[PDB]
């Protein structure tokens, strides 16, 4: 297609120490690897992050609107925006556009004290859910974490970390479409740190070699 | 056609009648020789006239089967000429019209040979 | 029925230096197998030390290149002559792009300039208004031809240090401008061989703190 | 592709352009198009290339027999009929686009066949995505009572208006020019005006770039003795 | 495709509705609630097309509990269903029509009994001892055609659910991973805690 | 979105030393019946400019329209309107650019090509290309249909690069022109034997030329093509 | 195309225009589409090129063989052979076929052949994309038992008609005329037949 | 949908001094999962390199179907096929699949054991043959490759230096390409020797 | 339908057949398709009936209100509102309308509107389904200044030839004759044209 | 759509196969067995089109039996597995071509070693230490490309595929109503009795 679509690597999950958000950076036209560096984590505010799957430019776009209507809200309010009414905007939004084409699949991840820390999964489709974990591989949305569904509550943020590293690389080496690099999120009460951008080609080998998986692959 | 059966059978004593009686038309046929040297190959025959007033140089004893290879007879003429055909044409339709090249000498000779061989054999 | 969208073929390239910026493309105008021109300026200079070209759909391209332009004297008027950041434009490009979301500019669009560090900037957008800011980006017909190339000869990808097996990546060097054009010449160069679309010739305006100069390069004719 | 074929006093002459193209890709920069049916028949094939050289092949390899059957130098009007019923048969599934020429006892002669198996006689011609353009020339350029050289003039010409100006043709000219009562001259390469120009930079890495996991040495040779 | 049951009893009336979110191959949710509370007396279970069902389901519940602060008065559920269907009958001819079919489950205070209204997405209501939408609509049918009495306790009637849900598992070509159940009675409307 | 009706096939164009060069044939044809033959295609604005339009011919009755209206209406309060405020080739131009591209953008085009053919008041020759979608272009020789494919080749043989324009005469160009009109009529279908040439120069203004014909014709060639293959007679 | 087939007094004239088109492209501008299936057996083609060209061919072949058995054919068979290909082959045949032929006995004889492959014998037939225009011209002009240059003269005016108004038909005005005199090949040039 | 590009997968041939390279991507999919990384697409029949791109179940065919031909050819010929006659075989052997093809784009690769001349050719999968001096490319990142090859080669390159550019023409152009990589290997073929070389790549 | 409209000395005649098919049936035998949009400016109707009825009576609406305000208008002026519904309305509209009309100043006069809504002035006009066949016919036999009985036998023999080839015409030949003398109806039945 | 797992472990082939029947949203059958066994230390699961399969499956099975009976010996599981993909290859370009996907487990021999063959429906043959057909197939992948080591014992290979079963039945959308689990070693090929 023209447009710059995205149907896989993206994921969000809740833990103990807030939430984690990893995504790859791969951008696919056809078979055509675009780019193997785009931002897959769009970040709304300091305490807001969004997630891009479906259209990158219906992403990016209603996304950025979104936290212009978030600081707006602050402004008129003198309070943070809840994730709960965040969501809301993008979702009643999305939900006006609906049959038009528009092309979304979002975890909106924020951490406040009213709620904690929360995820909202935002369709195009005009669906919107509260979760504890969203993954979006090759065109396909789950709640259960790529690798093991139980994964932990009680996680260390370095483990968490791995956790949301070591499962987009699990997608990355499957999916043609998933690869190029791991960009990872830690989002907390006082706002998301990032958590740099790691090769997959160098994470691969280093994973292979450290943990032992992947004894299929020769290196 | 009702002849579906062998003309060429084994007698008693284990001969091929029909091969041996092929074998004595070619020996009442004229003399054809070949002899091989280092830089080429010679083939030759004598061009036995039926008629003064027949054109011998209308027929061709020794035949171009491919660029690189020619044949002589001895025996019965027509069965050569009909022989030459198939050979031309199976140089082209098992080999050159696959590999793009024309046949080594000793593969178009099986070709020819299987076609001697099953008029030998068939019905 | 009435088709509105075309294909005017060429190929487009922007590379960012540390302090510098390269965008080139080829000058040949195509429709199906038909020469419409082969000088038709594709690279525009944009005022604010901003370079564009909008490849794809030449109507679509000239469209968005004059509305841009256009919103740079706009922006000059309505905020006491502030110069239009290469950020500040590529964000104005994105909403120029996504007005028309629901019947697109079918173009591929790339910018070039300094950022406000004076460091080389080029960013690269979608047609519905999708973009990111990247080192290099070829956009048009022969960009699939140009990438893995540029991959290879800027980034130094599957490059390592001989006698090392593997273990030690060649290292990244700074790209002077002289290297840079070199690359872009020889990717074209390349592109032309291979691309019935690409040749005529090749025009590069290259971005300092000094401001925009144009270099132009002859390429095949067939 | 551009094909052409000029007619001229004593001959016929078929030139063709050397760019083979899959899509928007060029595959082949020194593709020959020019083909032999006979030694002094050739023909050049525009459409798909599989069949215009599987029909050039079997045509040539049927013409060969037939002329050793008959003792006689293949005609033209053989290869054409030959390939128009085939082509016909096929009902233009045959994607073979050929201007046919050559010299035989007859005389000299130039045709054209298109897929679905309809031919035309001309004493000019031209084929293939840069036909207009080499079409433009020879209808602006060509006279009764060309010479050799006048025709292969015009030939060349017509090509190189179809290389310069149409996407789909490119790169060097080849030339065919069959003479009554003479060998068939081939002239690969006749003209080669888009020559690569020196590229700035020289791509060869230093040994030892590339990353290897394994290396064997990979037995080619049969199973050996003792 | 989702299941929504609804059974009317002597006293009360029980929703059971399928924990399910799924949109092609993918399982989005496997703990949603497909309903939401109208009033203090009148629940309403809701499945259908992505989005539309809660847009639809949140927008009735905001206009009913407009009506109740306005009037400071409950709306009975012949008047709620009255107004829901109508909603619905408005979208089929509407340029993009709600594909939403909801199960209206009320206990009337001023009549003392419980009603259960089934309207489809084109507004077709009926008032039912028992419903269902969906491709489970015909098995659960014959099961509470058979099994059904109209003086059956909240006890006998969340009994014969659980054979309904129980049958629904093992014939399913879908897993629905499970249901939640609400009572709706003069009390009001609580889950039930083990199912 | 329509369908073009009564259409005018090629326009072809080139720039010389001094000016340019335009020339259209006189034919509306309606599909395979060439039915108008007295139609002008060459439509002049003022004595610099001549726009030559191909397709849809009730598309280019209100182009022609448009372009009227436009000499009226810039001659509205403007003293300068037959000198220094008199209308440029680059002026109309830019306004068909306009609404071509702006018919295309509501789905609804003028179903032409269009060739702008002047010289501007500084004496540079102006040649630019407009069509249905908007698209632009400009090169030292320019046609739409037809022409495109078998006109271009041979003006391209006289100018085939900015360099060669200064090189060329007002009578090697029109020449190249002529030629390429005879081409034409033998090899395209839509085409007809009678065409209008005009010619704007920088010294001797606008020569507008009617009623010209294919000449110089070779058909006696004919005579000796029998058959389609063995036939003899 | 516009080709037509004109009996007169002293035989039949076939006329052609000699165009050949891929979509407005004139392919050949030169065509000869007046075919020779006997000695004075000729047929005006228009359709699909290679359709009339491989029926023709093989309408030959059938005259030649039917000439050395049963001696010359008469010009009712040869359009027999003609609509026996055509009619069994219509679902994959596009052709329209005029076939002119000169007996001693029968003399001048026309027969058209549309594309469902029925036979009709008329005084003259006009067939072609360029016939359309001269349906009125030909039928107030036609006259039984015309001189050779009358019916030189009506072919050339026709013709002329049919190539003026129709973008499928053009080139030079080809003519074979079939008398017991013999064969002879008339062409007539676009200078001489524009200014009828 | 479209066969080609199914299963993914590509091919490179370069030509140098008195030597030829044929190298192969391993990936084998089911358009977006990755399946197997051990699919190589590189075969001899003697001397002579086969590397098949296309629908993977075709690729197995029809070097099960060129092994056949080429031990038949052996044995009647006494002798080992050519690089020159075996790429009419694969032309004829494709074309006579005119009007339901193999869905490949093969290669051949191989040096003439008489002339010891270096010998490449490319094929359409109806067997259309493209006899190129310098370099073949073939399969899902074909586009990439020649780019890579058009700008990375230059003539008359020695079999340790020809190692290293197919091998960065091959790798960067697979990178470009969501269906092809999972592992590379280079043969490098002399007239009476050929090293095969497994190459470390990026498994994404 | 066939239809024209041919300038003479003293002014111009309309010619029309009088047919009107639904498919194969004859909806209506003795249609009126010579239509009155001004006392001397006529229009001859080919297209969707609908489509013509509606625009023609459009026209004569705009033509009173012109001649209430500014006086007679010119034939011109009548061709030039055709041309405005016809262009603006051409996604909407079947329709092929001749406009004839006499002034004192221009005489007879003829424009000519195709489907797209362009405008043709010519000396005479043909059009409708059946005018595909007198092109050649017409373009042989048409002179300028001609007189009455000159124009009206031109218009009689070449409608005669159009019905007679065209299925979609037919019925009686019905004219208009607009001259300085008024404005004069003519009818001619099958048994007096068929025979011509 | 169905689910056909198979591992290779050390000394063993372990296959997992969905014991699930379904024709669109009707269930048939939920103790269906997808396995065939092909020669004595050679096991084919299969998956795909209905009829298509077991048509396929018994038509493999008769085939290698005769080539038993005949030969008095066991074909390999390579000779096998190139004996399927053939038939498999010969259906593409047929009138009506077979919609089967096949896992063949076997145990070999000669060389002591067991071996498992990934066959699609269009004859497209890969050797693998783990497999799968269908929708299950990418999400087993990543989780066996973390555990699998191929030293991996009959036992250890056996919990790696019931955490695969237990982790698929949460994250599909359809009830593939539990596994047959059988195993392909040195001594022949068994039903796992628990799983
Ligand atoms: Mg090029
Ligand atoms: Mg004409
Ligand atoms: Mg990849």
Known sequence: ?219 | ?123 | ?222 | ?226 | ?195 | ?233 | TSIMAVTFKDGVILGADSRTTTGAYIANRVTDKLTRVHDKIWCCRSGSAADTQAIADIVQYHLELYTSQYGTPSTETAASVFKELCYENKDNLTAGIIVAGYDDKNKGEVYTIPLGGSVHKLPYAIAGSGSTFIYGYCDKNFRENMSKEETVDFIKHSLSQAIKWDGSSGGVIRMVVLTAAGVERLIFYPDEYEQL | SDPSSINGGIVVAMTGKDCVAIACDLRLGSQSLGVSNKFEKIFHYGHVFLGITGLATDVTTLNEMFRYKTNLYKLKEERAIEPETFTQLVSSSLYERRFGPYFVGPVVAGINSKSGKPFIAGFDLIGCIDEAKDFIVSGTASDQLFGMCESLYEPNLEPEDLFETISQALLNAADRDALSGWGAVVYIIKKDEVVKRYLKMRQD
Not at chain 2, 71 to 81: E, K, L, Q, T
């Open chain 3, 1 to 222: 029925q009435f088709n509105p969208y075309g294909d005017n073929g060429g190929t487009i390239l922007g590379i960012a230096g540390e302090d510098f910026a390269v965008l080139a493309g080829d000058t040949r105008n195509i429709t199906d197998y038909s020469i419409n021109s082969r000088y038709e300026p594709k690279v525009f200079d944009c005022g604010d030390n901003i370079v564009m070209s909008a490849n794809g759909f030449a109507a679509d391209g000239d469209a968005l290149v004059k509305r841009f332009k256009n919103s740079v004297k706009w922006y000059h008027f309505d905020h006491n002559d502030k110069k239009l950041s290469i950020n500040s434009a590529a964000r104005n490009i994105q909403h120029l792009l996504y007005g028309k979301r629901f019947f697109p500019y079918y173009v591929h669009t790339i910018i070039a300039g300094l950022d406000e560090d004076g460091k080389g900037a080029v960013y690269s957008f979608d047609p519905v208004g999708s973009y990111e800011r990247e080192q290099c980006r070829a956009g048009g017909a022969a960009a699939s031809l140009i990438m893995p190339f540029l991959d290879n000869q800027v980034n130094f990808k599957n490059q390592y240090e001989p006698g090392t097996n593997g273990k030690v990546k060649k290292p990244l060097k700074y790209l002077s401008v002289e290297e840079v054009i070199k690359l872009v010449r020889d990717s074209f160069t390349s592109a032309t061989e291979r691309h019935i679309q690409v040749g005529d010739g090749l025009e590069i305006l290259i971005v300092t703190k000094d401001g925009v100069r144009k270099e132009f390069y002859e390429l095949k004719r067939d």
């Open chain 4, 1 to 226: 592709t551009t094909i052409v074929g000029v007619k001229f006093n004593n001959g016929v002459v078929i030139a063709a352009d050397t760019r083979s193209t899959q899509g928007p890709i060029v595959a082949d920069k020194n593709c020959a198009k020019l083909h032999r049916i006979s030694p002094k028949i050739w023909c050049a094939g525009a459409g798909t290339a599989a069949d215009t050289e599987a029909v050039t092949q079997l045509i040539g390899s049927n013409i060969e027999l037939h002329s050793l059957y008959t003792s006689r130098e293949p005609r033209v009007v053989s290869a054409l009929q030959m390939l128009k019923q085939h082509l016909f048969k096929y009902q233009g599934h045959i994607g073979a686009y050929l201007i046919v020429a050559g010299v035989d006892p007859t005389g000299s002669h130039l045709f054209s066949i298109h897929a679905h198996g309809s031919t035309d006689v001309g004493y000019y011609l031209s084929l293939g995505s840069g036909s207009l353009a080499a079409m433009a020339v020879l209808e602006s350029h060509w006279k009764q009572d060309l010479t050799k050289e006048e025709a292969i003039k015009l030939a060349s010409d017509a090509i190189q208006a179809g290389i310069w100006n149409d996407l789909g043709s490119g790169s060097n000219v080849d030339v065919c020019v069959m003479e009554i009562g003479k060998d068939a001259e081939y002239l690969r390469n006749y003209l080669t005006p888009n020559v690569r120009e020196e590229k700035q930079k020289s791509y060869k890495f230093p040994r030892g770039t590339t990353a290897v996991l394994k290396e064997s040495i990979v037995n080619i040779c049969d199973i050996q003795e003792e």
């Open chain 6, 1 to 233: 979105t329509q369908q073009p009706i009564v259409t005018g096939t090629s326009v072809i164009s080139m720039k010389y030393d001094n000016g340019v060069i335009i020339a259209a044939d006189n034919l509306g044809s309606y599909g395979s019946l060439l039915r108008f033959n007295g139609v002008e295609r060459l439509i002049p604005v003022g004595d610099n400019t001549v726009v030559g339009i191909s397709g849809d011919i009730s598309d280019m009755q209100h182009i022609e329209r448009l372009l009227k209206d436009l000499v009226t209406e810039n001659a509205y309060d403007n003293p300068l309107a037959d000198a220094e405020e008199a209308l440029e080739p680059s002026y109309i131009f830019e306004y068909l650019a306009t609404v071509m591209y702006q018919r295309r953008s509501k789905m609804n085009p003028l179903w032409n090509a269009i060739i702008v053919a002047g010289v501007q008041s500084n004496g540079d020759q102006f040649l630019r290309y407009v069509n249905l979608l908007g698209v632009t272009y400009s090169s030292p020789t320019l046609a739409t249909g037809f022409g495109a494919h078998m006109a271009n080749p041979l003006l391209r043989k006289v100018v085939d690069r900015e360099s060669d324009i200064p090189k060329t005469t007002v009578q090697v160009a029109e020449e190249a022109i002529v030629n390429a009109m005879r081409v034409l009529y033998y090899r395209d279908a839509r085409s007809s034997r009678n065409f209008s040439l005009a010619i704007i120069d920088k010294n001797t203004g606008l020569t507008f030329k009617k009623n010209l014909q294919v000449e110089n014709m070779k058909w006696d060639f004919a005579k000796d093509i029998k058959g389609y293959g063995t036939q003899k007679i």
């Open chain 1, 1 to 219: 297609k023209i447009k710059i679509a995205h149907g896989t690597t993206t994921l969000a999950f809740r833990f103990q120490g807030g939430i984690i958000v990893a995504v790859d950076s791969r951008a696919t036209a056809g078979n055509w690897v675009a780019s193997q560096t785009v931002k897959k984590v769009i970040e709304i505010n300091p305490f807001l992050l969004g997630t891009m799957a479906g259209g990158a430019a219906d992403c990016q776009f209603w996304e950025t609107w979104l936290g212009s209507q978030c600081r707006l809200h602050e402004l008129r309010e003198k309070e943070r925006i809840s994730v709960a009414a965040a969501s809301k905007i993008l979702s009643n939004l999305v939900y006006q556009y609906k049959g038009a084409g528009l092309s979304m699949g979002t975890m909106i991840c924020g951490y406040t004290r009213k709620e904690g820390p929360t995820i909202y999964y935002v369709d195009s489709d005009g669906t919107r859910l509260k979760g504890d974990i969203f993954c979006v591989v090759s065109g396909q949305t789950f709640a259960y974490g790529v690798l093991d569904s139980n994964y932990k509550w009680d996680l260390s943020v370095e483990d968490a970390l791995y956790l949301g590293k070591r499962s987009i690389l699990a997608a990355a080496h499957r999916d043609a479409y998933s690869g190029g690099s791991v960009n990872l999120y830690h989002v907390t009460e006082d706002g998301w740190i990032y958590h740099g951008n790691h090769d997959v080609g160098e994470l691969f080998w280093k994973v292979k070699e450290e943990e032992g998986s992947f004894n299929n692959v020769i290196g």
């Open chain 2, 1 to 123: 056609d009702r002849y579906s059966f062998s003309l060429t059978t084994f007698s008693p004593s284990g001969k091929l009648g029909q091969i041996d009686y092929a074998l004595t038309a070619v020996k009442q046929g004229v003399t054809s020789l070949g002899i091989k040297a280092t830089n080429g190959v010679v083939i030759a025959t004598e061009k036995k006239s039926s008629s003064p007033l027949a054109m011998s140089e209308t027929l061709s004893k020794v035949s171009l089967l491919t660029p690189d290879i020619g044949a002589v007879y001895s025996g019965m003429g027509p069965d050569y000429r009909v022989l030459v055909d198939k050979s031309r044409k199976v140089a082209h339709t098992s080999y050159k019209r696959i590999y793009g090249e024309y046949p080594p000498t000793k593969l178009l000779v099986s070709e020819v040979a299987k076609i001697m061989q099953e008029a030998t054999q068939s019905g």
């Open chain 5, 1 to 195: 495709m989702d299941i929504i049951l609804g059974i009317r009893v002597q006293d009360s009336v029980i929703l059971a509705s399928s924990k399910a979110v799924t949109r092609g191959i993918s399982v989005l949710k496997d703990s949603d609630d497909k309903t939401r509370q109208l009033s203090p007396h009148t629940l309403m279970s809701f499945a259908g097309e992505a989005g539309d069902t809660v847009q639809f389901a949140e927008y009735i519940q905001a206009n009913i509990q407009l009506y109740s602060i306005r009037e400071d008065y409950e709306l009975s559920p012949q008047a709620v269903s009255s107004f829901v269907r109508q909603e619905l009958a408005k979208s089929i001819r509407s340029r993009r029509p709600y594909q939403v079919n909801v199960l209206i489950g009320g206990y009337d205070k001023k009549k003392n009994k419980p009603e259960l209204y089934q309207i489809d997405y084109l507004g077709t209501k009926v008032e039912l001892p028992y419903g269902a939408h969906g491709y489970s609509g015909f098995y659960t049918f014959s099961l509470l055609d058979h099994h059904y009495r109209p003086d059956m306790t909240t006890e006998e009637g969340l009994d014969l659910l659980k054979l309904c849900v129980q049958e629904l598992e093992k014939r399913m070509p879908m897993d629905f991973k499970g249901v939640i159940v609400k009572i709706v009675d003069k009390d009001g409307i609580r889950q039930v805690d083990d199912f």
